[PDB]
């Protein structure tokens, strides 16, 4: 009986908060039932709840612009739900007939199971960290301004994807035109295969931490005839940006040799890493800069390392950074950081060489690739392999390691590559290593000057220093 509905609704009317028009709601509810209408609209009534039972035959429900915290059991044949502009914290089971779900501008942390006939889903402006498995006839999924870091499998029928203002670390895998709105995410790179997508497909990448090298490479080949892709296109400011005055203390070194070139390094280094937060990297670079501000010699030698690696090393800040750590190590060694710790210096050597091998591998993979920076690949290896390859001084990014075209097989191949290559070249590599030579100059200057005289191609230096090393290595047994 309709009387059961009317009585329940009348009871509900009287628990309205002062600004809440439950009275008009009951009129609308009653009108809807009496006439067996398919549409019910309870818009702009400051509803703080809904009655437990809604007209069971409605096919369309509008409950826009209230203060709803949750919804009651939805009618079984509902095809269209607009519940945008409330405070929804959860949703009830969605009826199998749902075609259209608009839930924009609520407080949703998750979504329930999505039924098969869903054609449009809008959950813009919520707090989603995840999407359920998407229905197989979904046409449009708008989900902007949430907190997603990954999408599920996109269905073949999908025709528009709006994931603007989210935390996506990489471009969604592609499943009639297809549209990907991906602005304001944390996409640091795109796949190489990207340009071989058909021109019915259109991608928006504007405002992402994509480096200017990646961006300029995109502009270059999209201009050349013949997938539409929309994307965006000195000197004391560079040191300050890595903190937290240090800016004023650094201002004094403005008019030094190769100053301009050092600000170029930092900013290119920043453009490649600045989305990592944690990292990790930022903390280590700052401490390193702190050491540079303390010594004049360390500063001057670092600037020249930046300068000498500018000719064709501009797409390889990874190497330059690895050499700047070398320069720090050399400087530290010459000031006695390693005695009696020839074993500790040996352990660190193994660590440096392992990282050097991984850098080789990174450079190899990226050398031809235009849409990824070496640092992306190099940090990926680092974070995935530090434990197995025991890399204590490695930067371990918690995010961004999901790089396109780096496979599990690459990871394993790399680890093995580091082992055999180490097993074959370390001792020789170490005998030529800068910081080792600083120790040999500082402490064993007796055998050093003798071996310098003993030398009277680089092949000879190798033979002479290997001799010198295996000598001193016997003493520290």
Known catalytic residues?
313
Closest to 179 (Cα-Cα) out of 165, 162, 193, 167: 162
Experimental structure resolution, Å? 2.8
User: Token pair of 9, please?
Assistant: 């609704």
Show Cβ contacts of residue 150 under 8 Å, excluding neighbours closer than 6 positions: 130, 168, 169
Domain 1-234 in CATH: superfamily? Ribonuclease Inhibitor (3.80.10.10)
d(CA 213, CA 54): 57
List the 160-162 sheet strands across, edge first. Answer: 39-41, 60-62, 80-82, 100-102, 120-122, 140-142, 160-162, 178-181, 201-204, 228-230
* Residue 346, burial from CB neighbour count under 10 angstroms (0-12, 13-18, 19+): middle
Q: Experimentally, how was this structure solved?
A: X-ray
User: Token pair of 253, please?
Assistant: 């070194």
Q: What is the C-alpha radius of gyration for the chain, rounded to an integer number of angstroms?
A: 32
Closest to 374 (Cα-Cα) out of 411, 319, 326, 309: 319
User: Token pair of 403, please?
Assistant: 């790089």
Helices (H), ranges, 224-280: 237-240, 246-251, 259-270
């Amino acid at each position: 009986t309709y009387a059961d509905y009317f009585s329940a609704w009348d009871k509900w009317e009287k628990q309205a908060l002062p600004g809440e028009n439950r009275n008009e709601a009951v009129s609308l509810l009653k009108e809807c039932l009496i006439n067996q209408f398919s549409e019910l609209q309870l818009n702009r009534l400051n509803l703080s709840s809904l009655p437990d039972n809604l007209p069971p035959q409605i096919t369309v429900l509008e409950i826009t612009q209230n203060a709803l915290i949750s919804l009651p059991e939805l009618p079984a044949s509902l095809e269209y739900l607009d519940a945008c502009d409330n405070r929804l914290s959860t949703l009830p089971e969605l009826p199998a007939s749902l075609k259209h779900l608009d839930v924009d501008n609520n407080q949703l942390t998750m979504l329930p199971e999505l039924p098969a006939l869903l054609e449009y889903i809008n959950a813009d402006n919520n707090q989603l960290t995840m999407l359920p498995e998407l229905p197989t006839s979904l046409e449009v999924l708008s989900v902007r301004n949430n907190q997603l870091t990954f999408l599920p499998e996109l269905p073949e029928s999908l025709e528009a994807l709006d994931v603007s203002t989210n935390l996506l670390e990489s471009l969604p895998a592609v499943p009639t035109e297809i549209f990907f709105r991906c602005r304001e995410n944390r996409i640091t790179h795109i796949p190489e295969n990207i340009l071989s997508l058909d021109p019915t497909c259109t991608i928006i990448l504007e405002d992402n931490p994509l480096s200017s090298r990646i961006r300029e490479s995109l502009s270059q080949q999209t201009a050349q005839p013949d997938p539409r892709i929309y994307f965006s296109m000195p000197l004391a400011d560079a040191v300050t940006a890595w903190f937290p005055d240090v800016s004023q203390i650094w201002h004094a070194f403005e008019h030094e040799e190769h100053a301009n070139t050092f600000s170029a390094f930092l900013d290119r280094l920043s453009d490649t890493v600045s989305a990592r937060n944690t990292s990790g990297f930022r903390e280590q670079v700052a401490a390193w800069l702190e050491k540079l501000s303390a010594s004049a010699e360390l500063r001057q030698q670092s600037f020249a390392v930046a300068a000498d690696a500018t000719e064709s090393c501009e797409d390889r800040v990874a190497l330059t950074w690895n050499n700047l750590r070398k320069t720090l190590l050399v400087h530290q060694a010459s000031e006695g950081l390693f005695d009696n710790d020839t074993g500790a210096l040996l352990s660190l050597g193994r660590e440096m060489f392992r990282l050097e091998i991984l850098e080789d591998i990174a450079r190899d993979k990226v050398r031809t690739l235009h849409f990824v920076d070496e640092i992306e690949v190099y940090l990926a290896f680092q974070t995935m392999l530090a434990e197995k390859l025991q890399l204590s001084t490695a930067v371990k990014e918690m995010r961004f390691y999901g790089v396109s075209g780096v496979t599990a097989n690459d990871l394993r191949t790399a680890e093995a590559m580091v082992r055999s290559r180490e097993e074959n070249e370390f001792t020789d590599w170490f005998s030529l290593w800068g910081p080792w030579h600083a120790v040999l100059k500082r402490t064993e200057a007796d055998r050093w000057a003798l071996a310098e005289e003993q030398k009277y191609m680089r092949e000879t230096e190798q033979q002479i220093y290997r001799q010198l090393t295996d000598e001193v290595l016997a003493l520290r047994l």
